[PDB]
């Protein structure tokens, strides 16, 4: 319900700042480590809720190999949570592996839908 252009806007303003980044990105790294989705073998873009048309178009536009890897990571997380264990520590996602891979597709679909409604509520100057 907060669309990703707003999140990216705030995050780019934080990361492009010299002071704000050096205070806030350590807190975010500790937040990511405490969150513990990586221990179940999941990247964060497997966590986003997919039942809106924006994410349905982003998942439809995602390429084939990325979609197969995403489906495997999801099925592995379900089987892991079914047994109340974690994954072995060699099977955890590393920080370099936790890449934003769906985010350009989400940002493109959101810019498309925003331009769509701004051109549906278009008004002329006459």
């Amino acid at each position: 319900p907060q669309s990703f252009t707003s999140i990216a806007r705030i995050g780019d303003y934080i990361l492009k700042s010299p002071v704000l980044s050096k205070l806030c990105v350590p807190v975010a790294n500790q937040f990511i480590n405490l969150a513990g989705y990586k221990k179940l073998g999941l990247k964060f873009d497997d966590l986003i809720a997919e039942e809106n048309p924006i994410m349905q178009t982003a998942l439809r536009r995602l390429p084939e190999d990325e979609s197969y890897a995403r489906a495997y990571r999801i099925i592995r997380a379900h089987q892991t949570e079914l047994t109340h264990h974690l994954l072995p520590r060699n099977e955890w996602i590393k920080a370099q592996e936790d890449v934003p891979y769906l985010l350009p597709y989400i940002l493109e679909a959101e810019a498309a839908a925003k331009e769509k409604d701004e051109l549906d509520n278009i008004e002329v100057s006459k």
């Binding site: 051109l119 549906d120 278009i122 008004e123 002329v124 006459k126």
Partner: protein
Amino acid sequence: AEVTQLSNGIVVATEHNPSAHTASVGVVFGSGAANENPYNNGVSNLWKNIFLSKENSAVAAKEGLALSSNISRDFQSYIVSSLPGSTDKSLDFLNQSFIQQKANLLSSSNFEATKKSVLKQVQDFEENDHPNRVLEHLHSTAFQNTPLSLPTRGTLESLENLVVADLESFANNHFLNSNAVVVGTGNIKHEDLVNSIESKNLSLQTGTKPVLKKKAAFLGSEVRLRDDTLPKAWISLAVEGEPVNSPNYFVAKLAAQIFGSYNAFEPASRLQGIKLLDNIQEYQLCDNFNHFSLSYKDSGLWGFSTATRNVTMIDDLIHFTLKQWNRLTISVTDTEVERAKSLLKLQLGQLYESGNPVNDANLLGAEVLIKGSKLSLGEAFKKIDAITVKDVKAWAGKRLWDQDIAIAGTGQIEGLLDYMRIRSDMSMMRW
């Protein structure tokens, strides 16, 4: 631009265009298929096709003339087009074989071959061309038992009782000097056309056409020519619209242009600025639609036609387009009016300003025949630019909001609901 003069009996109209490479003259009568019985239906088709016989058109081809003709509801035209230096060869042809010496055209063994090919033509129309035959059935059920209900091509049961006596009787009753405009488009000048139509002393006939005893009245009705062996479902649906010389003529054209036309398979037809598309695109309700505003002398028609293969959701297609029609009465925006203004100016510009002078001859003949002159395109644009949102709302409250409709359908129209649900869709309960 257009100039129009009146000779001893004939009105002459030209649209001179000196950058054209063909010139085109002809005669446009004022009695189309709305001046027939249900029993001589198809006489104007037989005159169109004996004017374009092979032995009548071979004589025109040896002189470099190309024949054309058009049967409509109100008018009918007979056009001879050629190179700009040979306008009097065309006037000579149109005189010596259509106007005065029409006894070789109406030969038996020419009438029989032409009647046979016209019968084959309408037989292949009635079973293969589905959107146009439901537009003709929408006309035949909206205006029933009044003269506007007649198909322009005629009828297979009607056409096989026709003889040459019927053709010459219609010729005596309607091919008259009081009923005809002589048109000239292309780069023929007006003074040369009047000088060569008074150089020859051309006279058509001298009577006056019979005046019809009843005017066309819109009857809210339906007709269902259902056929489960066809792939799609073709549905035309219309209200009574404006006739020509209305004050609401261009408002009806603009209100049809608001909802426009659509094709499901062209990618730039899915991106139009119509608010109906983001209701009918999610489940792919239709293949195409087009919103028309057909204007005649007596009455008119305003509505749409669709073809769809989603035969399970026809009723929601009808429901969504009629709930989009309701917005013209209640909540049509400024932007939809401006967009339809620009698209209507483009559509009228492509219709009138086109390279073909046969089409200009048909349009100029019908317009000058019905109202004595022709409205220019600049005046048409100044009448389109003056339409406001209040004009569209007033017109839609008059002609659209809670009015009787006429429906015609063929194909798999089991999913199409009855008259009363569709008619109750014509006015929403203010929500």
